[PDB]
Amino acid sequence: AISELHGPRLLLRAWRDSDREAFAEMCADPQVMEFFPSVLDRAQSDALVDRVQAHFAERGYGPWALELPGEAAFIGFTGLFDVTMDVHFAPTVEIGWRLAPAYWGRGLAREAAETALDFAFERLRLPEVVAFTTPPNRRSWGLMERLGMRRDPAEDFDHPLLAADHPMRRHILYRVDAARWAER
Ligand SMILES: CC(C)(COP(=O)(O)OP(=O)(O)OC[C@H]1O[C@@H](n2cnc3c(N)ncnc32)[C@H](O)[C@@H]1OP(=O)(O)O)[C@@H](O)C(=O)NCCC(=O)NCCS
Numbered sequence: 001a002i003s004e005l006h007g008p009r010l011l012l013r014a015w016r017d018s019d020r021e022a023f024a025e026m027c028a029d030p031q032v033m034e035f036f037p038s039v040l041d042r043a044q045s046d047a048l049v050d051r052v053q054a055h056f057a058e059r060g061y062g063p064w065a066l067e068l069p070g071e072a073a074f075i076g077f078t079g080l081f082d083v084t085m086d087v088h089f090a091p092t093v094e095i096g097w098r099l100a101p102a103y104w105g106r107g108l109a110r111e112a113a114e115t116a117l118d119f120a121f122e123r124l125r126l127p128e129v130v131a132f133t134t135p136p137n138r139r140s141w142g143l144m145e146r147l148g149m150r151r152d153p154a155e156d157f158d159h160p161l162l163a164a165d166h167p168m169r170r171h172i173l174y175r176v177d178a179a180r181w182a183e184r
């Protein structure tokens with residue numbers, strides 16, 4: 001029984017088996033997956049869910065499944081994931097998000113992220129949370145900066161889990177520390 005979190009509209013909860021079909025549909029959508037190397041099939045979507053569930057088991061937090069009580073059982077994920085890869089800003093905790101496209105444009109990722117960052121800073125009492133994306137993914141880094149996260153362009157980096165010559169290799173880094181979060 002992991003910690004569920006609430007916003008005014010959203011419930012951030014543990015993943016359920018019944019989420020897997022809806023999540024696979026999202027991960028097969030080229031508009032959802034545009035700024036990733038490819039769309040995913042069901043097996044790959046399920047492997048991602050399994051990784052998330054292992055993270056929750058090990059850490060007590062993770063990328064929560066998003067439910068919209070009064071509206072929809074599952075609309076995607078938003079939450080925290082430990083950064084352990086060989087990058088300059090590791091080790092730390094990242095925040096990220098993936099919403100079904102019918103739910104974009106509503107401030108729902110913003111609300112989910114605010115809820116997750118409140119947990120990060122108030123409950124976990126983390127010193128900092130980061131987020132990273134590619135330059136063309138304006139919807140994603142726009143959300144980062146709207147949350148109050150900030151970027152130093154000198155901290156751009158090549159993603160180490162991508163090939164050294166991969167077209168999407170260059171990522172940008174945003175950070176928010178506990179003090180900056182408290183000042184809002
Ligand atoms: C990144 C992603 C989660 C952003 O979702 P989003 O809906 O655009 O983000 P927000 O929740 O902040 O909503 C902001 C939009 O809602 C609108 N909005 C409406 N009501 C709002 C409210 N109450 N609060 C905030 N914004 C509101 C804003 O005007 C903005 O619209 P705009 O883009 O047309 O200007 C989504 O595009 C996505 O899932 N992308 C695919 C997966 C992905 O690339 N993930 C990131 C990998 S790094």
Ligand SMILES: [Ca+2]
Pocket residue numbers: 058
């Ligand atoms: Ca263990």
